[PDB]
Amino acid sequence: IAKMRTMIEGFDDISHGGLPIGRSTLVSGTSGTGKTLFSIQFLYNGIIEFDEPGVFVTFEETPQDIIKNARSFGWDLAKLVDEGKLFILDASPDPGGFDLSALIERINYAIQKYRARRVSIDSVTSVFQSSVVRRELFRLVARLKQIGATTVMTTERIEEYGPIARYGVEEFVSDNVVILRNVLEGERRRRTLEILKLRGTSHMKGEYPFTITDHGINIFPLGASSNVRVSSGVVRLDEMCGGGFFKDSIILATGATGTGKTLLVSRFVENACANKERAILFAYEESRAQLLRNAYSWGMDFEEMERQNLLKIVCAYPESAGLEDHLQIIKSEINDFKPARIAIDSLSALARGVSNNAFRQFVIGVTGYAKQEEITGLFTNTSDQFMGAHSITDSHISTITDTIILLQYVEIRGEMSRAINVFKMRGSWHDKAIREFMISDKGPDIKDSFRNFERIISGSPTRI
Amino acid sequence: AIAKMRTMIEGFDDISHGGLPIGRSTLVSGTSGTGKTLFSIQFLYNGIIEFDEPGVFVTFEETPQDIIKNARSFGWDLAKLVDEGKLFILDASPDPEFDLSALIERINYAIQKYRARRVSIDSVTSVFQASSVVRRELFRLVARLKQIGATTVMTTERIEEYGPIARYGVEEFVSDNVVILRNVLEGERRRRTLEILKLRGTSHMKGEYPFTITDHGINIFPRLTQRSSNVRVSSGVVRLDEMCGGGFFKDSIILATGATGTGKTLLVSRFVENACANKERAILFAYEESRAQLLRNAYSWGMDFEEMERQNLLKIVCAYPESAGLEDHLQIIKSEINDFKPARIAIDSLSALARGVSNNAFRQFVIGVTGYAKQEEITGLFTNTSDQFMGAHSITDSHISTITDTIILLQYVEIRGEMSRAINVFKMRGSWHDKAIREFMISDKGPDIKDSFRNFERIISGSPTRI
Amino acid sequence: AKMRTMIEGFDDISHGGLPIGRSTLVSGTSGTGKTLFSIQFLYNGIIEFDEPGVFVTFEETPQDIIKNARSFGWDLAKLVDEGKLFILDASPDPDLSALIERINYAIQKYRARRVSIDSVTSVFASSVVRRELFRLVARLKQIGATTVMTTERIEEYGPIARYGVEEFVSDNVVILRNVLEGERRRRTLEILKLRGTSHMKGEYPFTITDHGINIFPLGLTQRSSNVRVSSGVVRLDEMCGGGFFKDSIILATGATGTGKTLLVSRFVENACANKERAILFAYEESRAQLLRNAYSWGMDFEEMERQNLLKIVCAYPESAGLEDHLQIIKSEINDFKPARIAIDSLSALARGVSNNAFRQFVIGVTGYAKQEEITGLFTNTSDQFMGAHSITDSHISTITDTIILLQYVEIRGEMSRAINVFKMRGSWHDKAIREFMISDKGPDIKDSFRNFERIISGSPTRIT
């Protein structure tokens, strides 16, 4: 069964070629899921990408309303209509029998007049305002199939995980069914598109995070490397990794609050700017001011990094939006800036309230996108327990990370001294010595290891 | 690229990025006592009292006097607006003893008889009260109103929460924009959370945003744009300032964690006083101790709370963490800060408000309190009691240590059958701090930071060993 | 403006009472205290405000209302023949227009200001109830008479009405609930809404006693003095710097058989011997058992009981709900008017109840004690007999001003105990883990363990 490209980023991969040709697809979902956007972004692509005219049957929205709605996306549905490459067939009774019979002929007329191959009726539910519905639908879908033109059927649902329709007859009548959801994750909303089935061929089974933006529906499917050494900004740290960090690697700094992750990030961001290489600093824990000021405590003028167009500080709250939204805001700035290296301080912040699965998917997306663009990225994680921590991360996301720089507090006599350690180094040698290091106005200072101490991991070492 | 209209609702203009769609219908569904009628009333008042535009109010149940009377609670004299020819309570009430085209034709009269731009129909559910019998009628009114080019604010009712957005499960798709008012209650507390479900053609803030009804209307709660300085402020203990490398930073969040009765409430007392000694304003929010017990306890430390109370340089606001929801609590703090306008704030204790509240809802509070404290350049010291007295593995059980700049970890140390304490600056952002677990004693002159336990091992545990 | 209902608490929750000239809807399950509220609402305004009240019945006979009123010691008979109260029967002998007709008439024969209708459910129909409701409601508002309309319900957290039309049909809606917390019940009044003026939100625990509805709201505005009181143990008085505080809350925490009941009893004797009144709320031991162990400690409770100085009340932690328990506490406190109150124990009362429902009770008795210049010592038994890292499993150590720590210490194959003043709000205390032995004449607080390490773990190590 041949398929038609929708030019919707992600959807072509989720359906494996797009939607089955000369067949009607069902796109049901709650209010404000992006059903009408999925229909106005369908045809919108088949004109400015394959020059194949399109028809839009509206059952409530006026031809001017949709013309004004697509104006937010930057699309001109008025120029496409006047250019004869689009036609909005109004089905709204201007203030039950021959309605279908008539409307069907009005569609066949336009479809057979504009030489169009893609149609979309939105919404079929509103028109019916079971046996009559599921029955009078077959005729529409049948007649739609007779003119051999793929179409999109916009339907609405009350519950989010309840019925996949409204009358229970919207389904078992369509060949292909796509479901748009706006799942409420406590207080945050997460839209997920899932193809329930596609009569004929195969596709991606399950849910896939998407978002509406200036570019339209941006769906993200999950199922979609030189030995060049790079400096970290710390002389002694580059030696503990056997040269430095790999150009195409994911460094991860972990340890309790006040360990020095934010310090390592600052130097791993300034070192770039020092070598005519630009870098992005994704702040979430503190503001730009505090970064500049606290950064200024150790030198590295973060102001000159902005004037040289080599440093971009993006600060925003970890609950300001949802992972799907956050990930989009990340990749976006990366493309606009083209940074040599990025930095998320911190990951633990984005793991607050979000579900582990939704987090794991996020880290994979960010890391994956960063790894498949030759962009060296460092990620910070704060350990819940400041001492005695038996896990590097409580999110179980270490396998994704390539390097691990573990920081921890050491109780020496009656004082608190931190201890830097290269936990692992993928594709290189690393120092296996738990070295101690202080923090001064000139940044980090690595020294000797605790060779004459015991139970260093615990956080309460013992002398010999 | 869509004409937006400011609602002048504290927050609502930040959620939709401008307000509501111009010349379009907006649905505001929700249960009884959610704030549907208030919202609509505030949509008119704000609309007329600022931009100078005529509003129409289509009442169904309540009479054109009730709205005028109820609205007076927030200091809104409709009498001045009803007589000045700005507002008009178009009565559509069933007589105390399906003509949609009728009202639709009557509504156009007032709209055109005032040269409007805003309208609001209270509970269009009371007309129909057949899903198809409603959608057709609903669509007609919204469609008709659309040609008028006036922004309509609908109001529907909801039977059960976390289910249908309306009552007939059709009204949502009958309007262009759908705002859902919620009054979800966790246990025995309530929480008002407004959300924009949809907004055809434009962008908005997705998800649920906490709000509260007050005597100033609906107050919604929506950016990491604050300031920072190297200005240092005293903590009230010279020994402590030396441990912080001069004293606490002015614009920063200080968290003092430790077991029950370690000196957290002591450090607060000495912190709320150093403001009063420098002729600076300071507020104290007590959620455990009482103004009597607080003032008394503090007097055994040569601190005259009563004196500073009368010098208008100190405010003690005692209240129970289970008295109201986390949303109200936040508004109170913000209100007391906008009224007294202090340079130092003190929440005793953060652990008190975390009791019987979801960590996520509680994190939001700390972000709301801390955030509003940093942007206003107000030094905030927060107290947190650990669930474990000795052997504390994590710094906070609520996990809010990544949101604090300075941390002062107090704890007990079983030393030779005795029970001493030990103050320590765990971390200090943009400053050097003493990294030593120094022993201290309490007395009639406050704290006493002495030497460290240099000849002791496993100090953090609770039971130190001799080396 | 609102009309003071003079109901224990409700006047605070409603921030005054019921809006004057507006009908307030009161709905709940069968046995939530609807009729009572409607009755107590009228009897108050008549007996105090001197406001004629009219009661409309539909299923209950006028000879039953006055028959049930005698249960709370209310004489409706007098009020009937006196013309202060009038009961209008609208229950057909074994239509809507004639109701308000007779109602409006009966609201003028006595110049009535309060009206109570029970119920607006037995009268009924689809939207008819949503049409027949406005008729009465609008008619009552025309006569500016504060009405107490009722509603019926089958679900506690389901619909707010039996039709779901009267919900948003009124202005002020109050919801009563008889929620089943496992095997026991919990009455909770709540004000859903009130168009015009502010009010308290959320649920509020209420009880039904022989004095009507007793709702316990919220308000931390008591007093605090430096008056020192004894504890019964001389050395225990010196470890607090001159004994306990009159205006203070003391807590005795430890495993099982540390000396909590021994230290409780001694606290009740000192009050008695000082010619002061004391009450013991025993929930674990029994009268006969408490009278035995006490005699085995040198103190006699019979003597102190016969001298009307020591009241002893024992019950089961599952006998009734927290709201009921609190009532008996507040109730038995007033009548006896003690100088010292002792609860043994808060642990037994925590078991089965929820942590949130438990704290509320602890904030009730705690608050009520401190707000009555009465001293309170509360016993809490820990779940771990050795190796506890929390003072309470319910985390109520922030509510207590003084804490006593009793723990076992395995010392050379012997299981000795240890007293220690953990904290003393506004006083100096001894910061030492003093060993103590229990015997005939009560407890013997001896020396501490200066030659022992890690004593707070249960199993220390002698360091010579």
Ligand SMILES: Nc1ncnc2c1ncn2[C@@H]1O[C@H](COP(=O)(O)OP(=O)(O)OP(=O)(O)O)[C@@H](O)[C@H]1O
């Ligand atoms: N430019 C934009 N930026 C962000 N979000 C947008 C933008 N344009 C539209 N949206 C979002 O996409 C959705 C648009 O509604 P759409 O008409 O696509 O959905 P629908 O499923 O047809 O809903 P309805 O039943 O209300 O018609 C809304 O959730 C809206 O917030």
Ligand SMILES: Nc1ncnc2c1ncn2[C@@H]1O[C@H](COP(=O)(O)OP(=O)(O)OP(=O)(O)O)[C@@H](O)[C@H]1O
């Ligand atoms: N000017 C300075 N001189 C010396 N040490 C400093 C200076 N400024 C900060 N520090 C040290 O650096 C620490 C902060 O390091 P950093 O900001 O990297 O912490 P972090 O591990 O990221 O913690 P968080 O979880 O709060 O983000 C402070 O605790 C302090 O000891």
Ligand SMILES: Nc1ncnc2c1ncn2[C@@H]1O[C@H](COP(=O)(O)OP(=O)(O)OP(=O)(O)O)[C@@H](O)[C@H]1O
């Ligand atoms: N006048 C005094 N002299 C000596 N020690 C005192 C004096 N007043 C109080 N203390 C000690 O200091 C403690 C005060 O504890 P504070 O309330 O400051 O700390 P906290 O940890 O916040 O307490 P809580 O857990 O009750 O909130 C008392 O428990 C007592 O041990």
Ligand SMILES: Nc1ncnc2c1ncn2[C@@H]1O[C@H](COP(=O)(O)OP(=O)(O)OP(=O)(O)O)[C@@H](O)[C@H]1O
């Ligand atoms: N005459 C006595 N001589 C010596 N010890 C005694 C005597 N009477 C009681 N005890 C001691 O007192 C202990 C009981 O004390 P108490 O009843 O106060 O315990 P508790 O800490 O309240 O524990 P629980 O409530 O779980 O029983 C006994 O286990 C015993 O060791």
Ligand SMILES: Nc1ncnc2c1ncn2[C@@H]1O[C@H](COP(=O)(O)OP(=O)(O)O)[C@@H](O)[C@H]1O
């Ligand atoms: N070339 C190398 N020389 C020395 N050690 C190496 C080298 N490559 C890898 N390693 C060590 O092996 C670790 C990774 O081994 P790997 O098989 O990936 O383990 P795992 O599956 O547990 O992550 C590195 O972190 C490092 O310690």
Ligand SMILES: Nc1ncnc2c1ncn2[C@@H]1O[C@H](COP(=O)(O)OP(=O)(O)O)[C@@H](O)[C@H]1O
């Ligand atoms: N002055 C006020 N202060 C605080 N809350 C108020 C005030 N006036 C009204 N309210 C609250 O407003 C709510 C009524 O909102 P309303 O506009 O009637 O919405 P709805 O129709 O959805 O119930 C009630 O919960 C009431 O307590």
Ligand SMILES: Nc1ncnc2c1ncn2[C@@H]1O[C@H](COP(=O)(O)OP(=O)(O)O)[C@@H](O)[C@H]1O
């Ligand atoms: N004299 C009394 N003392 C204590 N409790 C009582 C007394 N009389 C009734 N009760 C309790 O209070 C309840 C009050 O019920 P009522 O006011 O009729 O409410 P409803 O109309 O919702 O059934 C009774 O069902 C009973 O459990």
Ligand SMILES: [Mg+2]
């Ligand atoms: Mg649509």
Ligand SMILES: [Mg+2]
């Ligand atoms: Mg960090």
Ligand SMILES: [Mg+2]
């Ligand atoms: Mg305190």
Ligand SMILES: [Mg+2]
């Ligand atoms: Mg006992």
